[PDB]
Design an enzyme around this catalytic site. Sequence first.
Site, PDB file in Angstrom:
ATOM      1  N   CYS A 292     -84.766 -98.965 -42.394  1.00 51.19           N
ATOM      2  CA  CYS A 292     -85.315 -97.603 -42.560  1.00 51.19           C
ATOM      3  C   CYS A 292     -86.776 -97.689 -42.326  1.00 51.19           C
ATOM      4  O   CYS A 292     -87.395 -98.715 -42.625  1.00 51.19           O
ATOM      5  CB  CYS A 292     -85.131 -97.057 -43.967  1.00 51.19           C
ATOM      6  SG  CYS A 292     -83.474 -96.588 -44.303  1.00 51.19           S
TER       7      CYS A 292
ATOM      8  N   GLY B  11     -83.806 -96.727 -38.058  1.00 49.58           N
ATOM      9  CA  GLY B  11     -82.824 -95.852 -38.666  1.00 49.58           C
ATOM     10  C   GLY B  11     -82.574 -94.718 -37.700  1.00 49.58           C
ATOM     11  O   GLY B  11     -83.509 -93.976 -37.355  1.00 49.58           O
TER      12      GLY B  11
ATOM     13  N   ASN C 227     -87.853 -97.599 -47.976  1.00 47.09           N
ATOM     14  CA  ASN C 227     -87.191 -98.535 -47.108  1.00 47.09           C
ATOM     15  C   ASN C 227     -86.884 -99.692 -48.072  1.00 47.09           C
ATOM     16  O   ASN C 227     -87.790-100.330 -48.610  1.00 47.09           O
ATOM     17  CB  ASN C 227     -88.048 -99.057 -45.971  1.00 47.09           C
ATOM     18  CG  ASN C 227     -87.363-100.219 -45.232  1.00 47.09           C
ATOM     19  OD1 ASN C 227     -88.002-101.169 -44.797  1.00 47.09           O
ATOM     20  ND2 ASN C 227     -86.040-100.169 -45.160  1.00 47.09           N
ATOM     21  N   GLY C 228     -85.609 -99.863 -48.385  1.00 47.54           N
ATOM     22  CA  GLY C 228     -85.202-100.925 -49.270  1.00 47.54           C
ATOM     23  C   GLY C 228     -83.827-100.641 -49.837  1.00 47.54           C
ATOM     24  O   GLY C 228     -83.019 -99.895 -49.253  1.00 47.54           O
TER      25      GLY C 228
ATOM     26  N   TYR D 198     -84.796-109.648 -35.924  1.00 44.54           N
ATOM     27  CA  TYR D 198     -84.239-108.481 -35.264  1.00 44.54           C
ATOM     28  C   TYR D 198     -84.733-107.049 -35.529  1.00 44.54           C
ATOM     29  O   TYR D 198     -84.818-106.235 -34.607  1.00 44.54           O
ATOM     30  CB  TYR D 198     -82.715-108.541 -35.512  1.00 44.54           C
ATOM     31  CG  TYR D 198     -82.007-107.249 -35.253  1.00 44.54           C
ATOM     32  CD1 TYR D 198     -81.688-106.865 -33.946  1.00 44.54           C
ATOM     33  CD2 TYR D 198     -81.710-106.367 -36.303  1.00 44.54           C
ATOM     34  CE1 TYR D 198     -81.093-105.625 -33.675  1.00 44.54           C
ATOM     35  CE2 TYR D 198     -81.116-105.129 -36.051  1.00 44.54           C
ATOM     36  CZ  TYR D 198     -80.810-104.766 -34.732  1.00 44.54           C
ATOM     37  OH  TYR D 198     -80.210-103.563 -34.449  1.00 44.54           O
TER      38      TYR D 198
HETATM   39  O1  LIG Z   1     -73.136-109.752 -33.793  1.00 45.74           O
HETATM   40  P1  LIG Z   1     -73.442-108.342 -33.940  1.00 45.74           P
HETATM   41  O2  LIG Z   1     -72.949-107.841 -35.218  1.00 45.74           O
HETATM   42  O3  LIG Z   1     -73.083-107.503 -32.796  1.00 45.74           O
HETATM   43  O4  LIG Z   1     -75.006-108.369 -34.261  1.00 45.74           O
HETATM   44  C1  LIG Z   1     -76.115-108.884 -33.512  1.00 45.74           C
HETATM   45  C2  LIG Z   1     -76.304-108.085 -32.268  1.00 45.74           C
HETATM   46  C3  LIG Z   1     -76.471-106.576 -32.461  1.00 45.74           C
HETATM   47  C4  LIG Z   1     -77.927-106.319 -32.405  1.00 45.74           C
HETATM   48  O5  LIG Z   1     -78.199-105.667 -31.140  1.00 45.74           O
HETATM   49  P2  LIG Z   1     -78.351-103.991 -31.039  1.00 45.74           P
HETATM   50  O6  LIG Z   1     -78.673-103.583 -32.415  1.00 45.74           O
HETATM   51  O7  LIG Z   1     -77.050-103.516 -30.527  1.00 45.74           O
HETATM   52  O8  LIG Z   1     -79.403-103.635 -30.043  1.00 45.74           O
HETATM   53  P3  LIG Z   1     -80.785-104.120 -29.710  1.00 45.74           P
HETATM   54  O9  LIG Z   1     -80.737-105.619 -29.440  1.00 45.74           O
HETATM   55  O10 LIG Z   1     -81.141-103.295 -28.462  1.00 45.74           O
HETATM   56  O11 LIG Z   1     -81.796-103.900 -30.819  1.00 45.74           O
HETATM   57  C5  LIG Z   1     -78.569-107.713 -32.431  1.00 45.74           C
HETATM   58  O12 LIG Z   1     -79.794-107.740 -31.665  1.00 45.74           O
HETATM   59  C6  LIG Z   1     -77.554-108.607 -31.735  1.00 45.74           C
HETATM   60  O13 LIG Z   1     -77.476-108.362 -30.349  1.00 45.74           O
HETATM   61  C1  LIG Z   2     -82.738 -98.202 -44.563  1.00 46.46           C
HETATM   62  C2  LIG Z   2     -83.057 -98.364 -46.026  1.00 46.46           C
HETATM   63  O1  LIG Z   2     -84.063 -98.953 -46.406  1.00 46.46           O
HETATM   64  C3  LIG Z   2     -82.106 -97.741 -47.003  1.00 46.46           C
HETATM   65  C4  LIG Z   2     -82.800 -96.865 -48.037  1.00 46.46           C
HETATM   66  C5  LIG Z   2     -81.871 -96.575 -49.208  1.00 46.46           C
HETATM   67  N1  LIG Z   2     -81.337 -97.848 -49.737  1.00 46.46           N
HETATM   68  C6  LIG Z   2     -80.692 -95.725 -48.721  1.00 46.46           C
HETATM   69  O2  LIG Z   2     -80.910 -94.737 -47.982  1.00 46.46           O
HETATM   70  O3  LIG Z   2     -79.544 -96.091 -49.046  1.00 46.46           O
HETATM   71 MN   LIG Z   3     -79.139-107.109 -29.672  1.00 49.81          MN
END
Ligand SMILES: O=P(O)(O)OC[C@H]1C[C@H](OP(=O)(O)OP(=O)(O)O)[C@H](O)[C@@H]1O
Ligand SMILES: *CC(=O)CC[C@H](N)C(=O)O
Ligand SMILES: [Mn+2]
Lengths: 492, 492, 492, 492
Positions: free
Chosen positions: A1, A27, A101-102, A258
């Site tokens: 978030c 988010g 965010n948390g 990530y």
């Molecule tokens: O094994 P998984 O559960 O699929 O999780 C890891 C994936 C999904 C996520 O990519 P996205 O969030 O799809 O996209 P982006 O890399 O563009 O941020 C991350 O960077 C890995 O590629």
């Molecule tokens: C994305 C995030 O930090 C979640 C905020 C709070 N836990 C919620 O919306 O559930």
């Molecule tokens: Mn990815």
Amino acid sequence: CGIVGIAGVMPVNQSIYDALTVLQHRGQDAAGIITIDANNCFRLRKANGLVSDVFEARHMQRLQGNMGIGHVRYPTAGSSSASEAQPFYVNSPYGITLAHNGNLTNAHELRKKLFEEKRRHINTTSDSEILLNIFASELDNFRHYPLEADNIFAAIAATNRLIRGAYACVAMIIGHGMVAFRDPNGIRPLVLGKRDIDENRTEYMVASESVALDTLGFDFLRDVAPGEAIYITEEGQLFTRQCADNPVSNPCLFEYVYFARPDSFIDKISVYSARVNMGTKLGEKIAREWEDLDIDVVIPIPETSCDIALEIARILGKPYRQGFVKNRYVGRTFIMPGQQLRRKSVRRKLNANRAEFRDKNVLLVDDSIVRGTTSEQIIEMAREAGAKKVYLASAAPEIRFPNVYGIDMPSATELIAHGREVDEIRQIIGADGLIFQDLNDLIDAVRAENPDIQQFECSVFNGVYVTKDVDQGYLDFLDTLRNDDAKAVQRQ
Amino acid sequence: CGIVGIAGVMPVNQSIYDALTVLQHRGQDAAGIITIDANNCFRLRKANGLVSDVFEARHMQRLQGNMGIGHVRYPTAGSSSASEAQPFYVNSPYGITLAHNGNLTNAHELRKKLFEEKRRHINTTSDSEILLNIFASELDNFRHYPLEADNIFAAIAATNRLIRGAYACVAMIIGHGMVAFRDPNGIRPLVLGKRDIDENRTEYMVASESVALDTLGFDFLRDVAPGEAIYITEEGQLFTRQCADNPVSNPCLFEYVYFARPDSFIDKISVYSARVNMGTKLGEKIAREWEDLDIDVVIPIPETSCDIALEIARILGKPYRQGFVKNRYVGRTFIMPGQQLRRKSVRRKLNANRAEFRDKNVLLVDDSIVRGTTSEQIIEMAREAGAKKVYLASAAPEIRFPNVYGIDMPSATELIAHGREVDEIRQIIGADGLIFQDLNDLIDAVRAENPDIQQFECSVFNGVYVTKDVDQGYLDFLDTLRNDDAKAVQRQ
Amino acid sequence: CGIVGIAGVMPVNQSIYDALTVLQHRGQDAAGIITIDANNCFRLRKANGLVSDVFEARHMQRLQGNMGIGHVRYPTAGSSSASEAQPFYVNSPYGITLAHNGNLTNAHELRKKLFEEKRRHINTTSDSEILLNIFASELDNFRHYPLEADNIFAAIAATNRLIRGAYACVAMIIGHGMVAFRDPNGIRPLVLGKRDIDENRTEYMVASESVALDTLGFDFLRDVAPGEAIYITEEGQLFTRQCADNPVSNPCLFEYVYFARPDSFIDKISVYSARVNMGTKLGEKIAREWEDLDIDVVIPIPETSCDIALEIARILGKPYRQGFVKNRYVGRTFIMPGQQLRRKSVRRKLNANRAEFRDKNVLLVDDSIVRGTTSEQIIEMAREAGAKKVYLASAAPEIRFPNVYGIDMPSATELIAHGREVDEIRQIIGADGLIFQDLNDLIDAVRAENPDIQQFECSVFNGVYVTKDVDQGYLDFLDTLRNDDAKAVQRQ
Amino acid sequence: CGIVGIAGVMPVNQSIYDALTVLQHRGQDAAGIITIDANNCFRLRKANGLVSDVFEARHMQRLQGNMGIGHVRYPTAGSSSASEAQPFYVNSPYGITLAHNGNLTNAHELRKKLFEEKRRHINTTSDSEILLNIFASELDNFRHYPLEADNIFAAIAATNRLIRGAYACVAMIIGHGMVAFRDPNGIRPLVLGKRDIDENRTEYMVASESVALDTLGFDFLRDVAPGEAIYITEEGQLFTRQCADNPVSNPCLFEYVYFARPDSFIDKISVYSARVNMGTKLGEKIAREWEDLDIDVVIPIPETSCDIALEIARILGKPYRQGFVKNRYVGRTFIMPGQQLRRKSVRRKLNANRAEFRDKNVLLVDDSIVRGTTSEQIIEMAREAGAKKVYLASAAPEIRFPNVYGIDMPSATELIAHGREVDEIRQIIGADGLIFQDLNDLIDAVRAENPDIQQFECSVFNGVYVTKDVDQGYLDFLDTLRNDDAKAVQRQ
Ligand SMILES: O=P(O)(O)OC[C@H]1C[C@H](OP(=O)(O)OP(=O)(O)O)[C@H](O)[C@@H]1O
Ligand SMILES: *CC(=O)CC[C@H](N)C(=O)O
Ligand SMILES: [Mn+2]
Ligand SMILES: O=P(O)(O)OC[C@H]1C[C@H](OP(=O)(O)OP(=O)(O)O)[C@H](O)[C@@H]1O
Ligand SMILES: *CC(=O)CC[C@H](N)C(=O)O
Ligand SMILES: *CC(=O)CC[C@H](N)C(=O)O
Ligand SMILES: [Mn+2]
Ligand SMILES: [Mn+2]
Ligand SMILES: [Mn+2]
Ligand SMILES: [Mn+2]
Ligand SMILES: [Mn+2]
């Protein structure tokens, strides 16, 4: 978030919209913007969807004022109902709105507390609403008008004593100003900046990541220290204070791997460099353990892994090719709510440039492997395009434990690495080879940027939760509620 | 405006909907329903528009619980914005939601108070919101969790001490129950009723008028006494208490003249009888003051005047003819927000059966003349229809004073009888005669049904305001703030 | 259904909106307004709902032009989907839009025809769309630009040869003008009027009923003769012509009994007087057959029966009392789509003024009894309020046959009088007495106004369909499709 | 714009949706899908917005049938109104719906014709609508029901005879089938593919790009030859015919430079290779013309230029660094409707990784510079990021001419290279160097993949318009009608 706070001297609405846009990647489920206008009223607009769908000119015009807060939501608690979209609001004491965010690990407990002890009413299953309410009641201890920054700080200190988990918060207290604070463990990101308008009037702003500051022309001041609360008055006076007894810097590691945009500097660590360093350590591990391997090309799985992959191509002295074309109208599958939505998203988000795989042993590189969602399909795709052999290197170590600090990983059983050896995971996704970054490495990869950080928050990797209080019974409850099927049934 | 509140054992949404529908004549501008689901959470649905437009299946399925309140709005304060639609809610203490039919005459005085003093936030310009907050701030003076009936009443009495004006209110306090109170003057209507379910479970509802009880199959109990507070707990217990210093019954006379539905019984008075009674008095007045006149037919201006006219036609031994056809799909033009809207709405609302007027001396009858919108147009029609002579009789006395108790009449200058003698008004609308029910006759017409009522809230008629806090500066204030031009300007 | 056509010299949009408002009582399911603008383009707005919900300022502004047509829909064929809301449009030849009040008895047949022979595409199950298309293809026989009024008339003559049933239509042909026509049997209503703007420029308008003319300040010219088509050019030139081989005047009788507003003059017959005449004949029948009966009061079932009842009260020399208070926010149950919607509507639309029934033998009077929907509940209500005895007089004879000319009565089995004696019907609704107007009477009741009418269209009463072609097999199909359950299943 | 058309045995809605999603980059402004259900009725859903916004489950469930077409719009004619969203439909003859990617250069000429001559009605200002009507009017010249493949082709050839410009079209004729044709010049892209189902049933689809085939699991057949018309009947038969007098392949060069997705193969040419090829030519050009220069890093301006830059970085033996982070949630700023929108969208779209520029001489690479929106802002960023020297290289030649074939570039004055020498352009954006790919190099870069293509539609580059019907008056016309100010003015 993503949360953003701007205590400025001019209409902040477009600036917040713009801020949430750069933080949109934190988010995608909903977004909200609440400002305070000249009549000291809260102007709110929140709903499910992307920042670009949520706010229309009609909304923007209604969003007047020079102080405001915004939020982009990635559902980690409660439900996906727009009623859990942030910011949240309580009309007393004073009128407080808060973005978080948390994730509160002791939400259920604080709930009994709030009704019976504190006499506040929680209408959603969002822990962020609870947070705002614990804050609200603490603040409700200082009756004499007006609240003093000491009181605000004292309230947050009390709050820090009550609540448990991870949180980067931003709030506005009507007729008072903007307040921001970070959990006592520095887990979730939050940086403070400013924009000196004219000789004597300085605007301030906090945000999950510095890119928001950059995009808006704000200067970086520093990261909000762990446990530290900030307080900008309606008059522009900045106040600060350590509000935790044992504040410590344990930044979220997944943020580097990530979550955050590469162009952000979290706790003096350029996510970009940490990710490049990750590429260094991983390519080194590959060179050392896969030294025999015959690789024709190094292909990144867009978007996150690219620079990590780029660095790996350089280290292995192999070419870096963009074999996969990303659909620029599909977001991050990983932060999407349902597994079927994510599973399918993967096939609509990526498509191979066939020529890049034909009669080639390719090394696919991704920032991380979590549910296995991506890697699974990606490899088939790689195969279908004629890849002779496909290997997969993960910039992050196996992810075997639930995240309870702001990332939706409530069910360990949903993680592919859970209870599985590297070799089994390789066999599942169907890769000829699969290699994981070593934790200790990843840690140096990040640390190298700021040695001051002694220990990161990396429970999803090693199951040691810094807030201590996270136990198996809590984890059990958590899974019973947030496992993909329980979530689905809740989606009716 | 109309409020309903049902504390029962069955889901109340539909019942509240049907009640708001039969009370729809009290506020065509907005509607709101908020319930308490089994999780002790509020489920709200309020927006600008009729009951039929505002609530659809999608909404109804969401409004779960066995206890909820409803509101149909006719703005008399603030603006036309759906944000000022009711009911309103505050989350502390405990979680209270309130719906109010009336107008507070000391709003300004309280807005300042609520902030610097009681630390609450008012986000709208609605006095109803302010009202909820006083009850809240008063209610927030008790912490021995849970609130005892007594504390609720104590907050209400402390509330009455603070507020001034007319108000029939109903609210819900999460975890405690439904409460309903009436102003110390009993200006705004409110009745209580029940629906025994079995050996013990008896359902309770409150509503601006008894017709809501009738349609819902609820047994009529009594009018909520002036200054009384009703409190039904969640467990079903009914507690009542006088919360006004020296309460007195001063029912709004206008409720009988025009506002209420005839099948309603307000303060033991039947609106239907009161109206026929008005026609008897008007008929007898016409019989003596105009005796030497030639009338061929008696025509009511639908729809409020119908019975009055029927009865007058009875007195005079003349034909009652529905000379005017009313459009089923045009509501009460009177309670419409702007004078330009109302005016256009009259030609739409009514049309003349040429047969009934041609070569005839007609006697038009109407519950009242306020701005002169209807009468001015009605007469032009009668003439156009071939009518020889057009005479008008208002069941009500000349309306020369502003109503500050929940009826939109802020500017005395917008009232045609203002600064005018009957004859001047006759000339404006263009009647060949114009007669008004005398004031002492009106009162006697209504009292005839419940002589205990000694005095009526009839400031619109005699400039006498029972709350004794209304004055010229205050009236001038209203005039300026809410005159049609002020309002029309504000809407843009 | 209501249709309106205005070939004027100024913006017609508000005038059409206003026209559909007075005709709103002919169709509450949807409304549509299509104009032609300066760029000879069609500006359309149609959707489900009432005229007041359908058109918002945003729509009104887009609805520019000085020539236009409108429609309010009462679903008698197809479905309740907004795609069957009228007007309809075909882009060639020329660009034609059409509104229809009626029903084609040979729709299925014309459908095969249209595809195979005529090569037109029908996308909905509306017979009105088919109508527009039969017209379109006929018109498509005159290639040389431009179409001559003789051609337009010739096309409609051809159409009259092909299509069967009842229809009052209004259409616009781009770059040509407004066309209007009536079936060869004068079944459905349609009147032509005008509004002379200035010395030389006269506006014209057609409409289902004259009230629309009245409400807009248009002068009555006359009823569009049966089989006659009208054609107003874009230049304001009126053209007329008999377009049927054997044109005859057989007006819909149900229009007088119930459908039309009392203030309309259909085929020189004041619906108002016909209804009063109905009151005369019925009260005479009651006096003659129920001469012993002890009646304390004559109560009308609002809205339609009132004047009919008023006259009956006078004839019996008994009082006329408005025992039932009508909810002014509930429409006509009878023209509502589903039986459950109608059945319930009855309890939300009417509520007894208890005092009017207590210890009283009342005579309830209604314009007609159709499904029994109303009478059923009304009597219980009358009882529950203390009526000693309740009798029911019907201004219309028993209704035992399906209407296939524009009124939704596809299933004879849905009519209460079907296969039942008066006494059985009385027993079903639970009335102490029930009396029906005699057909021959009703006919004189109407005829008395215009003896020229030799025979009315009253199939719902005597099963003799004037268009001849209506047989049992058609009726069977019709019921299989339009019976309440088949309709419900179609509503998914 | 992007068009898809699927004639298959399974419901196509989802497939069409997924196709529009992968073709979404060709038109972010609107999307439309229209299918044919089993009742041989059209089911349409088109509106302004992205595929993801326009289509929701509610819509998808309505889009039934196994044959349907789709369209993603980037307005190049008419207005931004959703009424000009595609596809368009006409009900006669037979019922045709069409989607067009291109621009007709003789619209005006045809609008007059269609009315007075062919008696059709055009309700918008979209040339695509006009196009549908010519095909219709041509198609309406046959009546021997049903239409033979031959007549369809005959109408298409007669159509081509009539129309001028670029167009890749797909349509559906109720009862006959799907047809697809390409302009006699093969300017606009269109490919055919299939999906054998079993022994006989083979599914057919057409789409602006092959990526749509790839994602849909369809076997690639070939590009629809210039001037060819494809016709798949409802029974599954595939007929093709040359319907242009003297067809010739003049593919839009810009499709390769920027428009198309790299994983697409247009006219046997891979966009991915063509782009790397451009980078090879650009790299070699930089290698000779700037040889005496010092560059520290090569940075692509995401996202179209990435591969080009990667390859250029290859040529020069310099580091390729993703110095610019692109916001995943900001689309192609280029194809956005207004210059003010695009400009704001660039700061949102991109952000600099300060690390990669500081104290360095950077080489930015971009597929092209058109208005100079991106480059002007990108350079300011590089500088701000601490960059010593900022050099820019466009993979494309200077763009000085308007595109009148389905690419929004009406005003030559809005093109930065217009009336300017390279150096003037260098000064405007503020680069320390600016180099453009030469034109003969571009063409050779693309032809290298399919030498058969002798000439490209590259008027934007060399002012040469193959249709030979474009001239200065016509260009001035466009300029006036659609210049940003004209458009912005029109939107209000
Ligand atoms: O094994 P998984 O559960 O699929 O999780 C890891 C994936 C999904 C996520 O990519 P996205 O969030 O799809 O996209 P982006 O890399 O563009 O941020 C991350 O960077 C890995 O590629
Ligand atoms: C994305 C995030 O930090 C979640 C905020 C709070 N836990 C919620 O919306 O559930
Ligand atoms: Mn990815
Ligand atoms: O026997 P039923 O099937 O109920 O049909 C006849 C009823 C319904 C209809 O009234 P509405 O259409 O409900 O209303 P109104 O009289 O106000 O036009 C008609 O005037 C009779 O009262
Ligand atoms: C109300 C009416 O005349 C129906 C028109 C046509 N038959 C239809 O909409 O079904
Ligand atoms: C994107 C494109 O091909 C435009 C086609 C047509 N002219 C339009 O829709 O504007
Ligand atoms: Mn697998
Ligand atoms: Mn009235
Ligand atoms: Mn009725
Ligand atoms: Mn019964
Ligand atoms: Mn670009």
